[model samples]
Target: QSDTHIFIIMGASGDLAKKKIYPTIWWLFRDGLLPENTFIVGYARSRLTVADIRKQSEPFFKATPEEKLKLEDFFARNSYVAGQYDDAASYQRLNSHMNALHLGSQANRLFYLALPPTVYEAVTKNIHESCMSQIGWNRIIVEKPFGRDLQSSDRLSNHISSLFREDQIYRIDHYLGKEMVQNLMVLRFANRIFGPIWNRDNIACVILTFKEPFGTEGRGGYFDEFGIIRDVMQNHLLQMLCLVAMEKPASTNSDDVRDEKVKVLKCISEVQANNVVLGQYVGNPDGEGEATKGYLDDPTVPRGSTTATFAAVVLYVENERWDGVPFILRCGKALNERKAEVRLQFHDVAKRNELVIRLQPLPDAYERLILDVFCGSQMHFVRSDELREAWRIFTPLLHQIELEKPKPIPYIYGSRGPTEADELMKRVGFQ
Candidate 1:
């Protein structure tokens, strides 16, 4: 019997759903990647019809005529339900909708929490109480900015784990879903040449960067709470760091690979206060004869906000393989270029082997991650312990910053970052 499945986006009317989730679902269906029996349900408080969703998501489609026909067919499997994030009554209604779409004993459920971290527990509790399947398995996919600090992250992790088994919960870092990030294992394990020189003895520094050409605009409410460290460095850039420095796993199995990654995390020293550089962009030319607004200029951001729009920090691994090697993680908004990549500078200080893992040009990280969810793969997802440990690795520096409330060095909005950031990179021997 074919297994029936419903993929639910809990906050379906938001930017993530309209821009990424819907387009990804369409492409997967168009390419025949999802299960034949799967359906899509958009769940949110806003009363939007499936037609409304298609309209909001159309600009992102960019499909051909045949593909357009496929999209129409895909929307046939799509539905919507308006509901509050934390309300139990809403979940009961959602379950009724799910139960109505039953496909006998083989019915499965997949929940994508396209909401914020604050409501994760409430939503998970409601799902467990009102929507858990008796016949088939249920899984939940969550995006990050997991928590502001270690204590909060641990609390959230513990609460979520109580509701679902580790395997059933996926903590997504989209960078992990990137094709190049996935290729890291193959690049290291499958190749003989990179293995010998991958260690600290030969490699001087490793820099992982995430740069965006645009600012928050007026959307600083969310970014203000977490800053660039939590927004990008802790989760995205750190995951990239683990991939770059982790030892070869025992096998291709998810646990084996993740265990190796955990070992790398275990070896990393907590980020130091002195070794980090934090900056906030100022209004300056965006290189197109136009000026870009600074972090403070965003209307949604609080005046006198100390949130760091750009964060550059150096980390060290205490283990034998990577000891003494510096891992520099940097990310910024309103920069000169928009790119995410991992660069390795070897013994010859002047020379560097850089891999430009382009984040744009379609089939993005979200598409890969969504596909992984359908296939029941946990290899690319960060486990709960991983999240706690990542927060553990950065908590000290984060707290020191909060306590001191040091002013972030200011930089031109269109420049790379603070000039001091460049000096820090050079000091660490990254050309």
Candidate 2:
């Protein structure tokens, strides 16, 4: 038999654990992807029993009445132990619970930290200190907002690296797992169709767009703090940009792919202050459309917040393959569109046609991501160096915006952003 896979979801009571993690695990088990001895345990500081864990996850399962039996069996494999992330005694109790499940034998432990960034270090330490699987292996999955800036992220990376081997730690960038994002490389390398012009010679520019039809409403708490740049541009959009621009890796190996990715990210020059457009949406005065409330109307936002609800920044990858090709990274909330897509404009006579890749098609980002962790494939996961370079590309721009407190250009809700945003794109060679 395979080793007993003991999965401890560190913050199992949170929204992510309930809505995404447990549900994905449920599917994997039902599909017989998990090993026969796989066992899941919920560990959070909240005083919750195994039944409480299932109860929180119940709503995400929209099953038929007969399928409820399968749900019952799924949650039956899941148990819970409440524990403090920092306290040794708490982890010991969690250790005992897991040990008891595996019948005192060594088991492969996968710890998914759905906890907040504030507790990542403490929880990582607790697991390394007391919850580690001695004879077997350990996998730790840490979610994003890896750090606020370059300095902080480096510190976090250095600290965590001290405890876990690089391969053993999975740094998640759910975007990397999307079907389109994963297909990017294969499309470029596998096919000879776009061979010659994939570079700056025939392609005019690349545009990555992330748009939303709604603003913060009352959920401005997190969005207001990080803004759209850190939330979308740094990780998601940058991941796509790397894939679009990187030379084919030596092999399909995760490290090889990531190595080429690192090279392209380093090719990026600084984001000029004048080449940026920032925006905040104002209320739509008309009778009918989506999201009429201005961002400031959301009471959760601070009174004088200068955070951008939308931004468009042009970056040049100063490498031979992509040199002179302006890559526009744009993201916004309260836009007329609700989609994530990439557009590659060609250097033809018209210069207006685009080969677009829409991102809504997916094998569910988390389904593939968590499965990769189980299968020991770091292919689509973000490496530490990859993350650092991504932060390097955006850190200066982020800090500049914060320090300048530049007023975001005002645009009406449920509309494309300011006219100036379009003009900015035109200034960079958009026909």
Candidate 3:
């Protein structure tokens, strides 16, 4: 008999689970991605049946009537358990439920946490104490905002390390799971056309961008607390930087791939305040009767907040291959348009032929990452050392901004950004 694969989602009532997780799961099941014996179990304190969770995910899922029978059967193989994250007895009950469903040869467990950062310790501790599978194997997938900075990051890393080996832990950054981002390795390594000219000699610079047209208008103070750099720059844009600049791995092994990523990350020094550009959006009186509200106009934000809605930073990799090339990382909210892209510009003497890969929005990233978790593939997920080095490059800048209360230049809402930001980009080779 085939082994039974049990999927357990903690904090199942949350928005991440409802919008991204369950919807992705249903589409994959409809397309035959899971094991034949796979079953899903959602755990949270909320009083929810499997049907309740399915109903919430329905709006996000676009299913055909022909696939309605598949959806019903998918739910038939699913169940739900309401439990406290900190209680060992609760995990024991969940474990028993999994064991009852495992009459086959072995039972493999895949634990995914969609919960808040505060409960990670408690929830992971309980899973280790009561829910580890003795018959087969276990893997746990963790989402990001791994920590606020370097100090707290190590503490969280150490705790999770004590519970599970690095092999068993998958630290997810969904940006790496994007179709274009993953295709970058193939575009660089597999083709002979880019072999000799992939270095600093020919490539002038790389620009990685993430932009959204909306602001944190009525939403809570979450964006205000972290700002644009911490919320986006340190994680997503930095990961794209590694993909753009890292040396080719000798082998296709997961650790080999990540080792190159780590080396490229450590090659760059910390971000300097002089090389950074920050902006805050002010009211634009174009359309509405009065004007568009600024970031300060949001009621949830504190009075006189200095959080930046837009940021651009320039970095240099001191390695042999990319010695003088600049890597410009940019991200903003309340921008002119929505886009996520990576552009590599070449040096002069040749007519400009560049490579750009903008992100696609359909059949989102979670499906790929979750499938990789099931396959025990760490090729696309983040490694701890890789994460640590990436944070080291930005921690000092983050600390300085917090202390100095650097005032971001004001730009009109819905426009590109402040002229100062554009000037900084041009000075740092923004072609």
Number of the top-ranking candidate, with lDDT as the measure: 2
Candidate 2 residue 187 Cα shift, in angstroms, is: 6.3
Give the TM-scores of the predictions, in the order they appear.
0.87, 0.93, 0.90
lDDT by residue for model 2 over 119-175, one digit each (tens)?
988988888999888877899998887999999999999889999998898988663
Instruction: Summing lDDT over every window of 10 consecutive residues in candidate 1, give the lowest-scoring window.
Output: 354-363
In Å, residue 193's CA in model 2 sits off its true spot by 5.7
Compared with the true structure, all predictions reach lDDT values of 0.80, 0.81, 0.80
Stretches of candidate 3 above 4 Å error? 63-65, 175-195, 288-291, 349-363
Over the stretch 165-249, how does candidate 3's per-residue lDDT look in tens digits?
9989998766323564355444435323554667988888788888877777655277888888877788768876776676767
> What TM-score does prediction 1 earn?
0.87
- Per-residue CA lDDT of model 1 for 350-399, tens digit only, reads 54565433343145556777777777778878888777889999999999
Q: What C-alpha RMSD separates each model from the true structure?
A: 3.3, 2.5, 2.9
